[PDB]
Amino acid sequence: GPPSGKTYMGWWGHMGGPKQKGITSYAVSPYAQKPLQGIFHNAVFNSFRRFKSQFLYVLIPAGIYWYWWKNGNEYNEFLYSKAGREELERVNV
Amino acid sequence: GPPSGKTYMGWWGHMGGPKQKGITSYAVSPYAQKPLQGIFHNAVFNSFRRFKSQFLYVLIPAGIYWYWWKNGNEYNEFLYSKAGREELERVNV
Amino acid sequence: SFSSLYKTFFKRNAVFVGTIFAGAFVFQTVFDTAITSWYENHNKGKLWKDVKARIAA
Amino acid sequence: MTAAEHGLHAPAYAWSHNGPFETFDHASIRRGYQVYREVCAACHSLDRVAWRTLVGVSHTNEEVRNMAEEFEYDDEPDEQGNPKKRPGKLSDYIPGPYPNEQAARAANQGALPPDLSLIVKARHGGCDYIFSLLTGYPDEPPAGVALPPGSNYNPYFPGGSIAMARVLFDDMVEYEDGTPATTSQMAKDVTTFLNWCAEPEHDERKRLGLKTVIILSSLYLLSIWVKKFKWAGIKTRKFVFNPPKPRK
Amino acid sequence: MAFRKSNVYLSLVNSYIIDSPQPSSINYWWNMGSLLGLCLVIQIVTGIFMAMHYSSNIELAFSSVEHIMRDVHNGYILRYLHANGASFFFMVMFMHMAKGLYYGSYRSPRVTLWNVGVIIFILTIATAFLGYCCVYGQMSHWGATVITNLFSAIPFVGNDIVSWLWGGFSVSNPTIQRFFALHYLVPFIIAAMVIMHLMALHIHGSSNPLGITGNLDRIPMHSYFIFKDLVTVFLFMLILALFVFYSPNTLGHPDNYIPGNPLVTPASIVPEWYLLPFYAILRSIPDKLLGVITMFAAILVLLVLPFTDRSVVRGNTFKVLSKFFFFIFVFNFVLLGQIGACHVEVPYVLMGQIATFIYFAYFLIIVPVISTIENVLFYIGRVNK
Amino acid sequence: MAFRKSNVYLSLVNSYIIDSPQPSSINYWWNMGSLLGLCLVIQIVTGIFMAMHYSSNIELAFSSVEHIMRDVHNGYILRYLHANGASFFFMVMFMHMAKGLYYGSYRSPRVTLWNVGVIIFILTIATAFLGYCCVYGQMSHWGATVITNLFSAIPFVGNDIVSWLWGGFSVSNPTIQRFFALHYLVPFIIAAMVIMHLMALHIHGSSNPLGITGNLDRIPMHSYFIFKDLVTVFLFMLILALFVFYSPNTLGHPDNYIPGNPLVTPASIVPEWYLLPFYAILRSIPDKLLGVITMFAAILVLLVLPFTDRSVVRGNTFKVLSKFFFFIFVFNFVLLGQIGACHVEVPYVLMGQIATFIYFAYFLIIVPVISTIENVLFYIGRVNK
Amino acid sequence: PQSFTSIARIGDYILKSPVLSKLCVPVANQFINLAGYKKLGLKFDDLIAEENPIMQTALRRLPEDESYARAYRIIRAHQTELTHHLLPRNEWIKAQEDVPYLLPYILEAEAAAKEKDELDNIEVSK
Ligand code: HEM
Ligand code: HEM
Ligand code: HEM
């Protein structure tokens, strides 16, 4: 194995990060817990929070886009209708 | 990079070998020599030595094999000739 | 899934690779049994078998 | 696009097979073949369908052997090197009306009647659009629409001018089972038969589809469960911070 | 040490699939490359198995696929899987490329990682196109005419290139036959390339839905993500099962059950969906040479993204103004696609044009602007003076 | 550090082709794997380029190759290169495998290295056979009958396997078509495998025509061997040029310009030369099941070679008794091949039988014997008491 | 890679002008809220991308107990983020906390770099 180029990742025991002191972790065996850890009840009060916190950032842009869609759509059905052939002969040439 | 499995090769400066002391090498630029370093003359006294030192180890086995080849070859041409159809009716069934 | 009804067969170990394949082998017949039935029924009258029935030639 | 160039949208009739659990109506298919045989065969090839393929679906082994041999396919030359005919086998593909592209057009004012074997997929809407173009030849080409010599009007075709004249006229087919040989019953069948023709695998395809999903769904839910289990230590994992005396 | 670590072969297996240290925090978005490798495998298996009954001669071509449909045992399953799968390949790949924009994966040290995926994406379009030209229906013969013809756009030599590339006067027989052969070749090139793609991925490891450093809380891909990835997998197969058995053509164009005909283009030229947004962009340009260029540029521009992102953080996650336009971008891109389906009628053309602008402007203009602003909001939005 | 070392991609390139530390002493024998990789590349390029004009339908098949011959521009060069090249592939590969026996490369730590090449060698026979079945001449249709039929030798299921594998009553059309498709697939498998083969090679590095440790006098593959390898390369192309333009069929069987015919086997069944020594071994056995087994065993037995070599040194180089039988082995193997060409006439059958014995006896008997003796000559041939 | 030295220039200016400052900072304040990040115990200097030399001059330099601090937050971040939740409301970093603890060094180092860049290409007039 020749030299390797330095990066920002290493493997365990030299992962690359800064030198941890102070934190203390605790966990419990996946056997040692309720099957269905926390389902329904209060785990769903979040299925509306994970929603709220973001929806606008999608809806607002989806909105802008879906109304713009509907508009010229309507507008096209018109100028290709009877009631529209007028405007057509003008807009189109 | 995880642990690698030990072998019997490394790269330069850790090639794997034992710890050299005593030898001293010398060489000279490929520019600094006669084009046609040593051709013909006495470089061919070896094209008969590199031959001699081995030929037997090939010839002897090639021999055994080429005479064995020729033999049953002859033998086959016979038993499929006029002069042979006799022996055939016997050897073959 | 009830802790009694499971632990009976398997005590406190998972299924074993071969028992799996065994179940797989069985399941695969038991299933293609059911589903092909429920489907031939759901489409009763419609199957060429049901139509072969009435129709004569 | 003018609604005339587009063609009128065929409506959502409620077919025997529509739905995830619905085999064709084989009785219906059986009818369509007759409606096929007596009516449209006059002009339309059905070349990618083979006699044997009918057996077990619309007919019975001889029933299709009978039909089969009513036609003389080409057959390997005698010992001399001269042609010969022979009846058909179940191994054969239902022969086209015409000997080539040309005579198909000669017999139709220069129109090339589409091979039907794949029609219910080579068109948008398909089953519906097939039904509707067949029960949608109205009496007269709408006020103002001026129709060319040898062309009919259909709202369901694009730009109405279809080179195929109407062909369903009640009862022209003698429905062997004894059903109202109407035009909306002559038609609904050849559609269900032509559906089959382009999608023979159909009833098995939803059969197997059934199995695939039931198993695959269960795996999905099963997989999920498993995941929360193996994650359970990381999910409910909980840290704490205690700053440390400054000496290093 | 353990054997899986020690062995020449199993050490790779371990270090890319078992013992790999992943950020602890990554979510189901990251399951896409996994599901990407799964499609490529579905493509290659079902393809080969189908090729065994395929003929690439311009006559037998269209029929032989019908052969695979009507005759080969499970052959219809072979086709509907190949075809629907190619689509899911493309969806999943967009979602994979999405994820990379949103969390700003394209961003150093991961540039090469990113860049290579742009090469893959290119090769996947090249691949799937050829596989389409191999059905030889209507959409096929005319698809194959236009793509061959993009090369005329090349000054001078351009027509000849096309003639060559055709092997004759038209998209003819020496064409479908090379399109079959090149369809065989290329997927191995993707796989070749997926390997360098995974090598880049490997030396830096995955990012996170937080755009901070992973190196403080890693966990090993086995058994978490191996099991996590298994959830998206089955789900993937389910929807794919759904299409394949129930909606096999709810994703294809009926013009393609019509045998290709070199004299008569249809009058409904909708191309593949995953392709549409480019068809749109192409059309948007009333000039031939420029139009071509702009279509290709629609994909290349993806390479500036690490320079124009001016930010100081990777990720729209803590980025409101960034999120917002990011979904304008997504939604534009979908609209652009709707535009591709509709006729070159009004206002559609002009709508098409505007989206196209929005498209490139997002990489080239919105992003470096917004991100520079967003740096400055981050400063003054706290400090004293 | 330098860039070629630092880059994710160029570091491999460097470490396997530029900066690799080779034993200083290795000779032109070692140029074989290099020249091996070169054939595999010649196979794949010319193959694809030919496939563009090939049809794998049992009708068009034989003709389409004539098409490639009579019509495609440089197409004859495409064929004669594909075909002659496959041969040179096989020669060079034997010489490569030779070299491995003689210098005892198969020998630890290089077992896996060795073993994998046995897999490659198997895949190359599988590959080239299928490529032959794709011409669909006489030798093709009957070659393809017998190999398909080797599977009947399998108890019970054996006939069915063959029926399956045929896709019908005989080597028919669903056969040549799968044989074409599998011919496409497999060479990528060889290449896949060449990579693991080169990985094994890499972690131990090459041996030497002295069977001692390299680690005291290494030099870097660039620029010595890169240039050394270039000498064997051109020379390789020269002889290949010679055949390709002047002796294009001095290596093929004329029965193959005859369109395959399922009713009539010829009466001169000579199979490919690189295959002959196995044809011989196969025939040597008057029992069907056993004969098959022994043919396959003729290749597998190659895997015991690191156990039966009992020696204490790698290499026939300092090994007189070893050299000697090593060339009996080579020469047997060639004779075995001559036997394959001749009719099952006398004494040929009995000669065939004896060679076959000599063959397996060399791995299984001569070698461990001789090498054990040779250990003991090495002891008493010096020491006092 | 828009420069911090450059964000300083712009953001200092805006902070100084009582004109600008009154217009901008309300929004900026509104922004560094909508970000969500102080709800994952994150200070803003935590977020700064590190895979580049300057930040690695700037973390090698960052006082010990300060790095232990960073650390806990960064792990707390990930941990919570993966729990698909937000912290206990009273664990959130509070508006006075979100202080540019890192920014001097980043600036300290940026400065140092731009200097060396210059001093590598310093020309000469005779
Ligand atoms: C069950 C009965 C029949 C059905 C379902 C049927 C169906 C069709 C269909 C689907 C088309 C395709 C047009 C399109 O969708 O673009 C077509 C065209 C045509 N049909 Fe028929 N057909 C039937 C009977 C007949 C008969 C009896 C004749 C003449 C004797 C005929 C002659 C033609 C011709 C000449 C065309 C060409 C029209 C064009 O090019 O637009 N068909 N038919
Ligand atoms: C054959 C197609 C592809 C395969 C098999 C593939 C595979 C993967 C895999 C397995 C990962 C790790 C899991 C994940 O992060 O999603 C990944 C991540 C990534 N991919 Fe791909 N990918 C493909 C397409 C692409 C494309 C088309 C691009 C860009 C145009 C791309 C760029 C990236 C980047 C930048 C990451 C790092 C994401 C992160 O930091 O989490 N990939 N890819
Ligand atoms: C990245 C991998 C691949 C992609 C994206 C891809 C894409 C496609 C597409 C879109 C089609 C037309 C499908 C249809 O509408 O019927 C197709 C057809 C086909 N492909 Fe592939 N393909 C891939 C790999 C392969 C491979 C490895 C083979 C191996 C032989 C293969 C063989 C075929 C064959 C024989 C057809 C014609 C039959 C059919 O259309 O279903 N493909 N491909």
Ligand code: HEM
């Ligand atoms: C695709 C076919 C092959 C390729 C591309 C290939 C490639 C190579 C290369 C490049 C080398 C280094 C140069 C050399 O030592 O010759 C090598 C050596 C070696 N090969 Fe192969 N080879 C192939 C076939 C085989 C086969 C068929 C076997 C055994 C059945 C084998 C076993 C070995 C061994 C044991 C070495 C080490 C030789 C030494 O120590 O010098 N190879 N091979």
Ligand code: HEM
């Ligand atoms: C290890 C690599 C390969 C080997 C050993 C091999 C072997 C062969 C052989 C012995 C033949 C019959 C040649 C003849 O006597 O005419 C053949 C034919 C053929 N091969 Fe390959 N082949 C290889 C790779 C490829 C590849 C990658 C392709 C890609 C399409 C290909 C395509 C063909 C075609 C189309 C033929 C029929 C035309 C001809 O016979 O020359 N081969 N192959």
Ligand SMILES: COc1c(O)c(C)c(C/C=C(\C)CC/C=C(\C)CC/C=C(\C)CC/C=C(\C)CC/C=C(\C)CCC=C(C)C)c(O)c1OC
């Ligand atoms: C850094 O983070 C990661 C991460 O690294 C990985 C690896 C995964 C897991 C992802 C993967 C394992 C994706 C890997 C993708 C691949 C391996 C794709 C490669 C696929 C190929 C190269 C296809 C090659 C296929 C063949 C050769 C099969 C063909 C063989 C055939 C057809 C034989 C059949 C023929 C006959 C005649 C029977 C993650 O989820 C992840 O996220 C946390």
Ligand SMILES: COc1c(O)c(C)c(C/C=C(\C)CC/C=C(\C)CC/C=C(\C)CC/C=C(\C)CC/C=C(\C)CCC=C(C)C)c(O)c1OC
């Ligand atoms: C330890 O000692 C060594 C040693 O390690 C090496 C490496 C060498 C040198 C040997 C090598 C470099 C051999 C390497 C062999 C290979 C790399 C073979 C691999 C070849 C492939 C994997 C083939 C793949 C090919 C393709 C994908 C090409 C196909 C592309 C095509 C056909 C495009 C054309 C199509 C169109 C439409 C234009 C030595 O000489 C040596 O001895 C001292």
Ligand SMILES: CCCCCCCCCCCO[C@@H]1O[C@H](CO)[C@@H](O[C@H]2O[C@H](CO)[C@@H](O)[C@H](O)[C@H]2O)[C@H](O)[C@H]1O
């Ligand atoms: C790619 C195609 C894949 C096909 C389908 C694969 C099916 C896989 C079935 C493998 C079953 O493999 C099974 O795994 C279980 C763990 O759940 C193993 O169980 C083992 O560890 C468990 C803990 O998890 C212990 O209780 C038990 O004492 C031990 O034997 C068991 O040895 C093996 O029998």
Ligand SMILES: O=C1C(O)=C([C@H]2CC[C@H](c3ccc(Cl)cc3)CC2)C(=O)c2ccccc21
């Ligand atoms: O006219 C076209 C056309 O222009 C495309 C388009 C779709 C996008 C293609 C594309 C090629 C390369 C890239 Cl990198 C992206 C998209 C270019 C061809 C089609 O796919 C098509 C299909 C069937 C009939 C006609 C057509």
Ligand SMILES: O=C1C(O)=C([C@H]2CC[C@H](c3ccc(Cl)cc3)CC2)C(=O)c2ccccc21
């Ligand atoms: O009868 C045979 C025959 O037996 C072989 C033989 C050659 C060696 C083959 C072989 C297969 C597999 C391996 Cl691992 C080695 C050799 C087996 C078939 C042929 O190649 C052949 C070619 C043309 C006509 C007839 C025949």
